[PDB]
Design an enzyme around this catalytic site. Structure first.
Site, mmCIF file in Angstrom:
data_model
loop_
_atom_site.group_PDB
_atom_site.id
_atom_site.type_symbol
_atom_site.label_atom_id
_atom_site.label_comp_id
_atom_site.label_asym_id
_atom_site.label_seq_id
_atom_site.Cartn_x
_atom_site.Cartn_y
_atom_site.Cartn_z
ATOM 1 N N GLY A 284 0.790 -1.216 0.000
ATOM 2 C CA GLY A 284 0.000 0.000 0.000
ATOM 3 C C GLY A 284 0.828 1.275 0.000
ATOM 4 O O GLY A 284 0.507 2.241 -0.705
ATOM 5 N N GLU B 105 1.128 -13.570 1.253
ATOM 6 C CA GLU B 105 0.037 -13.567 0.254
ATOM 7 C C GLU B 105 0.482 -14.251 -1.017
ATOM 8 O O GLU B 105 -0.241 -15.063 -1.602
ATOM 9 C CB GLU B 105 -0.424 -12.134 -0.080
ATOM 10 C CG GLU B 105 -1.379 -11.554 0.955
ATOM 11 C CD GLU B 105 -1.656 -10.045 0.781
ATOM 12 O OE1 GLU B 105 -1.119 -9.399 -0.171
ATOM 13 O OE2 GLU B 105 -2.409 -9.516 1.639
#
Length: 154
Positions: free
Chosen positions: A11, A63
């Site tokens: 992010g 992830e």
């Protein structure tokens, strides 16, 4: 099936800039995505945005391993994006990308470093979206969104 797209990204590198344009373009085509591990297998397509500091997050790296597992066992479609990182640097964990990776691995078990290295090498050679090969971010994101839309048919 629950989500069309699971986006994996750092992010701090892309959320408020590049990713905001991508998600807007996906929304305009009624492509669904989850809002920021369990959700990954619930998603038809994984979009992995490799950026300079992707490798500084164990969240992102874990992830990627799960995405790798879903690719292998659940036929998840995976689309890599290279956002100001060299694809071979991601693939081979070299250069700037590698050094961030190595820095990150210092506090970490050798087995998950291995699992990370493998998922990076596997995802980095997949057909995808290298920003240096497109005339702009907007042009790349436009093709990627139409790609993703075609993939929801399957």
């Amino acid at each position: 099936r629950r989500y069309d797209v699971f986006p994996s990204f750092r992010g701090e590198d892309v959320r408020d800039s590049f990713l905001s344009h991508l998600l807007k373009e996906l929304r305009g085509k009624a492509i669904t995505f989850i809002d920021d591990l369990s959700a990954i297998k619930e998603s038809r397509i994984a979009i992995v945005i490799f950026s300079k500091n992707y490798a500084s997050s164990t969240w992102c790296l874990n992830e990627l391993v799960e995405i790798h597992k879903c690719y292998t066992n659940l036929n998840q479609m995976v689309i890599p994006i290279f956002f100001h990182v060299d694809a071979s640097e991601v693939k081979k964990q070299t250069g700037e990308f590698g050094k961030v990776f190595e820095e990150t691995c210092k506090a970490k078990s050798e087995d998950e470093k291995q699992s990370w290295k493998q998922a990076l090498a596997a995802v980095a050679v997949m057909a995808g979206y290298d920003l240096r090969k497109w005339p702009s971010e907007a042009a790349m994101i436009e093709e990627l969104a139409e790609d993703v839309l075609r993939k929801t048919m399957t």
